[PDB]
């Protein structure tokens, strides 16, 4: 599973 | 003697229940995700305490709020959120450090073999 995070990248 | 509701006052909120696998496990989880489902079983995701966000795949754990999306073809709810962050309190309550080690040391989850042939 990949780390969500997203936020702003 | 600073305790507070954290460890003193009665029902903090007022009545609401802070979820619980035993009650909102298979059915509950299965409802959050939907039809889709990887090699593992949703009921499993429920055992660890993973509640989807109304859409399959992306699901956040209780307490450890671990957001995991796009799981692996060969993995398990516990193995995922645990390994990623070996500090999920809600987990310690589920099967304590006992299981925590089950993963961080050997292969956890995945049964149906009993003795593994
Ligand atoms: Zn967790």
> What is the C-alpha to C-alpha distance for residues B13 and B16, in angstroms, rounded to an integer?
7
Alpha helices per DSSP H over chain B: 21-24, 26-33, 42-48, 77-84, 89-103
Residue B7, CB-side half-sphere exposure with 13 Å CA sphere: 3
> A-chain residues within 8 Å CB-CB of B33?
none
Domain range enclosing B70? 1-117
Q: Would you mind telling me the total number of residues written for chain B in this entry?
A: 117
Using CB atoms, pick whichever of B58, B72, B75 lies closest to residue A4.
Answer: B58
Buried b (16+ CB within 10 A) or exposed e, B28-42: bbbebbeeeebebbb
Does the beta carbon of A2 lie under 8 angstroms from any beta carbon of chain B?
yes
> What is the C-alpha to C-alpha distance for residues B87 and B20, in angstroms, rounded to an integer?
18
Cβ separation A3–B80 shorter than 8 A: no
Experimental method: NMR
**Binding site, annotated residues of B for Zn(2+):** 61, 64, 81, 88
Contacts of B19 by beta carbon, 8 Å cutoff, 6+ apart:
B51, B62
How many domains is chain B partitioned into structurally? 1
């Amino acid at each position: 599973a990949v780390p969500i995070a997203q936020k702003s990248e | 003697m600073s305790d507070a509701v954290s460890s003193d006052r009665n029902f903090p909120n007022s009545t609401n229940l802070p979820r619980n696998p035993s009650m909102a496990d298979y059915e509950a989880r299965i409802f959050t995700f939907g039809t889709w489902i990887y090699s593992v079983n949703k009921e499993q995701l429920a055992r660890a305490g993973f509640y989807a966000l109304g859409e399959g795949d992306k699901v956040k754990c209780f307490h450890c709020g671990g957001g995991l999306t796009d799981w692996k073809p060969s993995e398990d709810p516990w193995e995922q959120h645990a390994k990623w962050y070996p500090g999920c309190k809600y987990l310690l309550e589920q099967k304590g450090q006992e299981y925590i080690n089950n993963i961080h040391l050997t292969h956890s989850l995945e049964e149906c073999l009993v003795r593994t042939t």
